[PDB]
Symmetry: C2
Subunit: 245 residues, 2 copies
């Protein structure tokens, strides 16, 4: 693989992304790509779990890109900047698509914890014209085919953060507080998983989202483990969705 | 293994069961193995066996006895409850009287319910674990207790999906107190492993979620696996594997 470091800029909010470009086996066919939005309660970007995951997925045959979305650091708000940064990243991939043999019909978004909120919201926002124009995403090219959420934060009042003050710090746009309440038949398929022993992020968050998803008849998969397992289920699910090639 | 057919009676509502007694390894070398009472699906009009049979064989391979309980149906213009619960408690009671002859670990009795059977098991998990309720449905006289329950695409709320009409509901039971098992869940409920496919239309997936949400609410050990495909280190069935692991961690698969 080839590692590419970049600093992109959109809506005057520069962000960092690391692109892990898969290398051809013969050294030609196109491979899927996964964008990873890390956890970190919007105070930092997590990497302890993200590193092993990015590797696992790639081994299955796909490119990966870690998207260090907007944080609250420096007295800032996460939204709507984070969505714009995501759409721009999907865009940055289409331009790199040919040079690195990237299948643009199989772009997958993956979010964890605080990162899961960004990915879950984008799944509701980037899927509706009204929303794409409202949050300025009409000029970005490309679209995702699905998402993977691990112990994701869905509702900004269902546990995390603990104070309304930290909530509004994330964003004062209540319309973006609850990702589940953005799910429409247009949302892309999603694979959700989490442990029932997680104290950092309330399991109800997952349930809330999975329900909405099920209500609007959108392909889904929920795995709430009781206590290497989920990666296998996720990969098998991606095959089912025909997103693995 | 050894198979045993029996027709038990309780509350004046006869019912039938089948027991598959696991055999010991070496006759020269004994130990008590867990037992799984399986309540079949069938929408309360019949007793399913297509999925149940294979499931029993797979779970037994892990080293556990299995009993199949053909609970009260609506046939002959009858109501499922409260008889169903009484029949389940009796079965557990009957097992406790056989545990010494068939090497049964009564500290490891698992209740697995599927489809309509899941309603029985989900309800029992709430009713048998509550004093007031245990007496309201005449269970104070039954011996033994389950340690956990498994649920496969079970019915949880009788007003959200299955059945379709309101008549079929009152038929199953005119006791609204037994319509939504998720409302009978309390910190006393036993750990439950739940699974189901999302594409399943026969019985709305929302049911699972409702019961799981209740379990989480009262901080009761619970796992949930809603597979996207309806076909359903780790072998490539799959849910049986997960469930087994779960029982292992739960220290119930000893
Ligand atoms: Ca014994």
């Amino acid at each position: 693989m080839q590692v590419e470091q970049r600093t992109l800029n959109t809506a005057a909010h520069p962000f960092q992304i690391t692109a892990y470009w898969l290398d051809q086996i013969s050294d030609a066919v196109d491979y899927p790509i996964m964008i990873i939005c890390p956890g970190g309660g919007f105070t930092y970007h997590s990497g302890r779990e993200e590193a092993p995951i990015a590797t696992r997925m790639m081994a299955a045959g796909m490119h990966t890109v870690v998207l260090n979305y907007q944080l609250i650091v420096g007295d800032q708000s996460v939204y709507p900047w984070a969505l714009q940064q995501l759409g721009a990243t999907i865009d940055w991939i289409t331009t790199q698509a040919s040079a690195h043999h990237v299948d643009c019909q199989r772009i997958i978004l993956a979010g964890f914890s605080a990162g899961g909120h960004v990915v879950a919201t984008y799944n509701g926002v980037a899927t509706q014209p009204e929303l794409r124009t409202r949050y300025h995403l009409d000029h970005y090219q490309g679209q995702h085919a699905a998402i993977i959420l691990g112990y994701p934060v869905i509702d900004l009042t269902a546990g995390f953060p603990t104070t309304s003050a930290a909530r509004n710090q994330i964003t004062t746009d209540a319309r973006l507080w609850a990702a589940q309440r953005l799910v429409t038949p247009a949302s892309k398929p999603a694979f959700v998983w989490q442990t029932a022993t997680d104290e950092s992020v309330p399991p109800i968050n997952s349930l809330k989202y999975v329900q909405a998803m099920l209500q609007h008849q959108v392909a889904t998969a929920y795995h709430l483990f009781g206590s290497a397992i989920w990666p296998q289920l996720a990969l098998r699910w991606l095959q089912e969705q025909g997103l693995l090639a």
